[PDB]
């Protein structure tokens, strides 16, 4: 069988408390005889759909909830249905984060928000505004230090500044996220990214600073500030830096607005171990003792479990995390989120490097995100019709193979399949493997090959 019955394989990111989770797994094993194996592969959030779309992969997948609507829409997750007594154990807003089209699609674990982390010996009174950072850096440079270093390679870390004065992913309106209303190139987003690029041009930051560079400099006492989440606090404790965790700086008087993630655990739709996965998550992990084991390894942030949060709430670092979360926004969980993030990543890296201007970079991200969002929604909405009607499927598959958006394995199956509908049934496995971006590219190719079909179906859709 594809997935092994009688054990649990769990994937979780290498920045989280995976040794603590493995300890919870050992407790489950001693009680049930069911072995629990915890793995942290690189790029797991991309690998998960690549294996789950073919019926393989881990039994349980951990990531922030923004990835989960895409997984659910791609047929990869089991519906979660806790009894009321269990549901009442977690904060209402955490269940909201894992609700997609009426159904719960994961168990929420903990609430993560970025904060400003500062060295209290170098900087007893951290800046309340982004605007005062250049003068602060000039001052620190005279003492052989710098003001601020944080990861500039992942848009998650720059988003709070881009959002502060008006950037947004998708507008919430009429009781839903409007995928036709993207806020990546408005004046607010441009102002925040321009502020960031100006820090780099003026040598207050370097475009190539990444996670490990910023962590190393802060934990060695070389830079006075960094921006990070709760999972980073463990290494800072070891480093002996006298650090504080506080509200992010304002920009143009507005709070920085971090995108808030809820670390969530989904169950693979293909798993033959769903009932014991539910027991593990509800009755071993989501207990005071379970979260304590994980949290002691790497801090989780503010946990979804109300009883355990009582233990954590008086920690000033957790209070700061929640202050920043309340000033930010919970991420959408919609499938289009991955396309938004890929677009914004490119924009920030290109603008920071000088490859593109801020205006050009964000204009391109806006166009690409909007186009992918609409195209992927179409593809998911009209799945049954596309499988029945698309005639150019082998040409589309050939094109996807060239741009490395489909595996040799799945391409092979499409190649050997007989008729168009059968090729399409198989090709949709590759679309479900590659998420919103591959679905968007499928749409673009289809519009090139069969414009009459696309226009006919779009009439029905709208
Ligand atoms: O090829 C470029 C890179 O592509 C891959 O990264 C993608 C992810 O696949 C996307 O999911 C998205 O990432 C988001 C992420 O979904 C979101 O939750 C948030 O991630 C935080 C996380 O919540 C927090 O717990 C902690 O782990 O830090 C994360 C930030 O590093 O923000 C992400 C966006 O920054 O977008 C990225 C690309 O930006 C792939 O993994 C990369 O290796 C690859 O280079
Ligand atoms: Na010290």
Short mmCIF file of C-alpha atoms in Angstrom, two decimals, residues 135-318:
data_model
loop_
_atom_site.label_atom_id
_atom_site.label_comp_id
_atom_site.label_asym_id
_atom_site.label_seq_id
_atom_site.Cartn_x
_atom_site.Cartn_y
_atom_site.Cartn_z
CA UNK A 135 19.76 57.98 12.24
CA UNK A 136 19.95 55.16 14.73
CA UNK A 137 22.11 53.11 12.38
CA UNK A 138 24.49 56.03 11.72
CA UNK A 139 24.95 56.29 15.47
CA UNK A 140 25.53 52.55 15.90
CA UNK A 141 27.96 52.38 12.94
CA UNK A 142 30.24 54.80 14.84
CA UNK A 143 30.43 52.16 17.63
CA UNK A 144 31.06 49.33 15.14
CA UNK A 145 27.48 48.01 15.29
CA UNK A 146 24.36 48.31 13.13
CA UNK A 147 20.73 49.11 13.89
CA UNK A 148 18.76 46.38 12.14
CA UNK A 149 19.19 43.08 10.32
CA UNK A 150 16.42 40.73 9.25
CA UNK A 151 15.69 38.19 6.51
CA UNK A 152 15.18 40.00 3.22
CA UNK A 153 14.84 36.79 1.15
CA UNK A 154 11.41 35.72 2.38
CA UNK A 155 8.49 38.12 1.87
CA UNK A 156 6.95 37.09 5.23
CA UNK A 157 9.53 39.29 6.98
CA UNK A 158 9.11 42.40 4.80
CA UNK A 159 5.32 42.18 4.50
CA UNK A 160 4.61 43.98 7.75
CA UNK A 161 6.27 47.15 6.37
CA UNK A 162 4.63 46.78 2.97
CA UNK A 163 1.24 46.37 4.65
CA UNK A 164 1.62 49.16 7.20
CA UNK A 165 0.41 52.00 5.00
CA UNK A 166 -1.91 50.10 2.72
CA UNK A 167 -0.52 47.01 1.05
CA UNK A 168 -2.74 43.92 1.16
CA UNK A 169 -3.01 40.48 -0.48
CA UNK A 170 -6.74 40.11 -1.19
CA UNK A 171 -9.42 42.51 -0.02
CA UNK A 172 -11.99 41.10 2.42
CA UNK A 173 -15.43 42.19 1.23
CA UNK A 174 -19.03 40.89 1.19
CA UNK A 175 -18.09 38.08 3.58
CA UNK A 176 -15.13 36.71 1.59
CA UNK A 177 -11.69 37.41 0.11
CA UNK A 178 -12.05 39.07 -3.29
CA UNK A 179 -9.41 37.49 -5.55
CA UNK A 180 -10.03 40.21 -8.12
CA UNK A 181 -8.90 42.87 -5.59
CA UNK A 182 -5.14 42.57 -4.96
CA UNK A 183 -3.23 45.23 -3.07
CA UNK A 184 0.41 44.65 -3.98
CA UNK A 185 0.99 47.77 -6.13
CA UNK A 186 -1.00 50.54 -4.38
CA UNK A 187 0.73 53.61 -2.93
CA UNK A 188 1.00 52.05 0.53
CA UNK A 189 2.83 48.96 -0.66
CA UNK A 190 5.16 51.09 -2.79
CA UNK A 191 5.90 53.41 0.11
CA UNK A 192 6.83 50.53 2.41
CA UNK A 193 9.01 48.73 -0.12
CA UNK A 194 10.67 52.02 -1.10
CA UNK A 195 11.50 52.60 2.55
CA UNK A 196 13.19 49.17 2.65
CA UNK A 197 15.12 49.72 -0.56
CA UNK A 198 16.28 53.14 0.67
CA UNK A 199 17.75 51.47 3.80
CA UNK A 200 19.80 49.26 1.44
CA UNK A 201 20.88 52.07 -0.92
CA UNK A 202 22.01 54.06 2.10
CA UNK A 203 23.97 51.05 3.46
CA UNK A 204 21.83 50.57 6.58
CA UNK A 205 21.04 47.05 5.33
CA UNK A 206 22.45 44.65 2.66
CA UNK A 207 20.22 43.11 -0.01
CA UNK A 208 21.61 39.62 0.56
CA UNK A 209 20.83 39.33 4.26
CA UNK A 210 18.95 36.11 4.85
CA UNK A 211 17.67 34.21 7.86
CA UNK A 212 20.99 32.76 9.02
CA UNK A 213 22.94 36.00 8.45
CA UNK A 214 20.45 38.12 10.46
CA UNK A 215 20.19 35.50 13.24
CA UNK A 216 23.98 35.21 13.52
CA UNK A 217 24.51 38.98 13.71
CA UNK A 218 21.82 39.52 16.31
CA UNK A 219 22.85 36.57 18.46
CA UNK A 220 26.52 37.66 18.33
CA UNK A 221 25.66 41.20 19.50
CA UNK A 222 26.61 42.84 16.18
CA UNK A 223 23.21 44.35 15.30
CA UNK A 224 20.80 46.03 17.76
CA UNK A 225 17.57 44.71 16.31
CA UNK A 226 16.07 41.91 14.30
CA UNK A 227 12.59 40.87 13.22
CA UNK A 228 11.59 37.30 13.97
CA UNK A 229 9.02 34.91 15.43
CA UNK A 230 8.79 32.87 18.65
CA UNK A 231 10.67 29.90 17.18
CA UNK A 232 13.81 32.04 17.13
CA UNK A 233 13.83 32.75 20.85
CA UNK A 234 15.49 29.45 21.74
CA UNK A 235 18.74 30.32 19.94
CA UNK A 236 18.69 33.83 21.40
CA UNK A 237 18.43 32.39 24.95
CA UNK A 238 21.55 30.30 24.28
CA UNK A 239 23.43 33.32 22.84
CA UNK A 240 23.37 35.19 26.14
CA UNK A 241 22.15 38.43 24.50
CA UNK A 242 20.04 40.56 26.92
CA UNK A 243 17.13 40.77 24.53
CA UNK A 244 13.59 42.11 24.56
CA UNK A 245 10.57 41.36 22.33
CA UNK A 246 8.36 44.34 21.54
CA UNK A 247 5.88 46.02 19.20
CA UNK A 248 7.11 46.48 15.62
CA UNK A 249 7.95 50.07 14.54
CA UNK A 250 5.22 52.17 12.98
CA UNK A 251 5.45 53.47 9.42
CA UNK A 252 3.80 56.78 8.50
CA UNK A 253 2.23 56.49 11.97
CA UNK A 254 0.46 53.21 11.18
CA UNK A 255 1.32 49.99 12.93
CA UNK A 256 3.39 47.44 11.07
CA UNK A 257 0.93 44.73 10.05
CA UNK A 258 2.44 41.26 10.09
CA UNK A 259 0.58 38.46 8.35
CA UNK A 260 -0.39 36.19 11.25
CA UNK A 261 0.07 32.45 10.82
CA UNK A 262 -1.63 29.65 12.71
CA UNK A 263 0.60 26.59 12.73
CA UNK A 264 -1.84 23.83 11.79
CA UNK A 265 -1.84 20.05 11.45
CA UNK A 266 -3.63 18.43 8.48
CA UNK A 267 -4.33 14.74 7.85
CA UNK A 268 -3.52 13.31 4.41
CA UNK A 269 -6.70 12.34 2.50
CA UNK A 270 -4.84 9.16 1.47
CA UNK A 271 -3.84 8.09 4.99
CA UNK A 272 -5.13 4.72 6.22
CA UNK A 273 -4.42 5.94 9.75
CA UNK A 274 -6.82 8.85 10.08
CA UNK A 275 -8.50 7.77 13.34
CA UNK A 276 -5.25 7.30 15.19
CA UNK A 277 -3.92 10.55 13.66
CA UNK A 278 -6.98 12.24 15.22
CA UNK A 279 -6.21 10.57 18.58
CA UNK A 280 -2.60 11.70 18.40
CA UNK A 281 -3.47 15.32 17.59
CA UNK A 282 -6.47 15.77 19.93
CA UNK A 283 -5.41 13.67 22.89
CA UNK A 284 -1.57 13.74 22.88
CA UNK A 285 -0.41 16.87 21.11
CA UNK A 286 -3.23 19.30 21.90
CA UNK A 287 -2.96 18.80 25.71
CA UNK A 288 -1.07 20.85 28.28
CA UNK A 289 1.69 18.20 28.45
CA UNK A 290 1.94 17.78 24.67
CA UNK A 291 2.31 21.44 23.80
CA UNK A 292 4.71 21.90 26.76
CA UNK A 293 7.04 19.28 25.24
CA UNK A 294 7.04 20.96 21.84
CA UNK A 295 7.20 24.48 23.27
CA UNK A 296 10.24 23.64 25.44
CA UNK A 297 12.10 22.60 22.30
CA UNK A 298 11.24 25.70 20.23
CA UNK A 299 8.62 28.22 21.43
CA UNK A 300 5.32 27.90 19.56
CA UNK A 301 4.03 31.41 20.24
CA UNK A 302 0.48 31.78 21.62
CA UNK A 303 -1.03 28.32 21.61
CA UNK A 304 -4.49 27.47 20.30
CA UNK A 305 -5.19 25.42 23.47
CA UNK A 306 -6.76 27.77 26.01
CA UNK A 307 -5.67 25.84 29.11
CA UNK A 308 -2.01 25.84 28.12
CA UNK A 309 -2.06 29.45 26.91
CA UNK A 310 -2.78 30.40 30.54
CA UNK A 311 0.74 29.19 31.38
CA UNK A 312 2.28 31.25 28.53
CA UNK A 313 0.24 34.48 28.60
CA UNK A 314 2.20 36.25 31.32
CA UNK A 315 5.48 35.93 29.45
CA UNK A 316 6.10 39.45 28.10
CA UNK A 317 7.38 37.92 24.84
CA UNK A 318 4.01 36.26 24.30
#
